[PDB]
Amino acid sequence: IEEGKLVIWINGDKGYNGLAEVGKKFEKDTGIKVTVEHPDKLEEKFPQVAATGDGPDIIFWAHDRFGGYAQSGLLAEITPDKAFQDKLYPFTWDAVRYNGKLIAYPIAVEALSLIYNKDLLPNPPKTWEEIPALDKELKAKGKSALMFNLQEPYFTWPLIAADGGYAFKYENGKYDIKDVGVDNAGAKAGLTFLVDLIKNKHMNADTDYSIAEAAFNKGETAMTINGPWAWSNIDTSKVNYGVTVLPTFKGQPSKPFVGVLSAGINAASPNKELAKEFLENYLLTDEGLEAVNKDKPLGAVALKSYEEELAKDPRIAATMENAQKGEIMPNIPQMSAFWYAVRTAVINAASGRQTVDAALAAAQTNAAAASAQNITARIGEPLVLKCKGAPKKPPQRLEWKLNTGRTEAWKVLSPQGGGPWDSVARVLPNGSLFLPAVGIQDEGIFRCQAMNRNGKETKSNYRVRVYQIPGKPEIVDSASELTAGVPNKVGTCVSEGSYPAGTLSWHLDGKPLVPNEKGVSVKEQTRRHPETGLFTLQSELMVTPARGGDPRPTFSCSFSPGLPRHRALRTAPIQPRVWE
Ligand SMILES: OC[C@H]1O[C@H](O[C@H]2[C@H](O)[C@@H](O)[C@@H](O[C@H]3[C@H](O)[C@@H](O)[C@@H](O)O[C@@H]3CO)O[C@@H]2CO)[C@H](O)[C@@H](O)[C@@H]1O
């Protein structure tokens, strides 16, 4: 991370151009450049890059992700004074408190609403149950009733929760991580209703954010479900729209999750004071929030003064009506596992590949499962796993067990005794498990239970994966002269010795080179060595140079692992020439 500037990550559905305008004002006053980026999957990328001390100085996301980041030590504790805190609503600060510490600045409160086309549907439906009949009416007129994003569980949750579904039970000021409400009767009822809509062709399981937005904004469907960030595109489309309370289900309100868009500071940032100045004195002001809100609406902002100014907007009132029928998202680390579990359940049930009951049963199990620490190790290198709670020397009451490619199911280990397991995984004096040289067959789960004389029990739970770095990639079978107007084989990139497979990518003039566009094609193959299990990849690049184009291209190929266990590897560049 570069000292003396600010890099900000925010999702691509938010007002990033407006935020960049706030950054320009900061730059005018301070000379400090503010770069706003909107990477894909930034909420998954952040914990990867920040864990190694890289990433943005500031990350924006709803507050639900932040407990996990904080637990991993990826966030700086913020230091607003009490006078600053008093400028924002107390419930918004609660959303960004983790283990007693403020770990992000709250920006705005979001909830989904029903958005409807007033020219098609003057009185929007009060119930989910009336939507099939409404769709039949509209289909007869060449339209449809409802389209919304069915790929992300955020959008389907309000219906799943209505009749009794919940994420984690809240009681005594705490979430019970084992009391999950994903496969109860209420969740099943809601998801069954959704799936029936799809079975009856009132909705399509493939509908995503872009498809639903396009259909609504072109006047093809009478309703959608979306948040405040979507309003600006509807304004542009000129559709005469209203924003209103979500339909009820079985007579009960839909319960959207309430998200607080929040800004965290990277623990690894050398620019923490600049970040504080930007967030407190530039962004969290009437003029700062206005700039962002004018780009894509924020909802009900956390800053009291500006929230009061905008409160008269009936779309914001509807957002708050819906929010106040729903639940605040927990910020606990287990929220990630909950969302992944429910995403899978909804996709599998909606596609018909699994019953609602079976999909939700699996999701329940996954969401409530004990957390495991992800461990990675390079093939051939040693690995040490701590038995938390064990005394530093014997006697120790502990038990290691594992479930890997070397075992059928669970194997319980014993103290060293000369048996063959001792050369693969053995218990050290301090109770740790030592694997002298990991291999592919060691991937799996490793667990320790340590018991103390006072009755204390401590469990350690590890999910172990391994990797190998291939040799530097090479380009072979390359053609140094290219002919415009016909396909030319630039060469074949080859990488040998990876685990897992990884992928090869081509680049032209220091930018990625995209297949099937502008006369580019790639033929790829993967081979696995029968004994070692390591992978060899090939990627053959064809290009059709355009006549009059740049006759001096520079190509290169790189290998990347799926997860960043190591850096990309690159070939030397090649510089074939286009000759007439
Ligand atoms: O579905 C897989 C997905 O799950 C998790 O994403 C959840 C977000 O963490 C949660 O905030 C919410 O996201 C919505 C934003 O709050 C809202 O501002 C707007 O951007 O729409 C978002 C939904 O698309 O809900 C999602 C679950 O749908 C997890 O964090 C992700 O890594 C994972 O991809």
Curated annotation (Swiss-Prot):
GO terms for molecular function: carbohydrate transmembrane transporter activity; maltose binding. Its main location: periplasm. GO terms for cellular component: ATP-binding cassette (ABC) transporter complex; ATP-binding cassette (ABC) transporter complex, substrate-binding subunit-containing; maltose transport complex; membrane; outer membrane-bounded periplasmic space; periplasmic space. The keyword Disulfide bond does not apply. It is found in: Periplasm. It comes from the Bacteria. Gene3D superfamilies: Periplasmic binding protein-like II. InterPro entries: Maltose/Cyclodextrin-bd, SBP, SBP_1_CS. Induction: Induced by maltose and the transcriptional regulator MalT. Permanently repressed by cold shock in a PNPase-dependent fashion. Keywords: Periplasm, Signal, Sugar transport, Transport. Pfam families: SBP_bac_1. One of its GO terms (biological process) is maltodextrin transmembrane transport. Part of the ABC transporter complex MalEFGK involved in maltose/maltodextrin import. Binds maltose and higher maltodextrins such as maltotriose. The complex is composed of two ATP-binding proteins (MalK), two transmembrane proteins (MalG and MalF) and a solute-binding protein (MalE). Belongs to the bacterial solute-binding protein 1 family. NCBIfam families: PRK09474.1. This is Maltose/maltodextrin-binding periplasmic protein. It comes from Escherichia coli (strain K12).
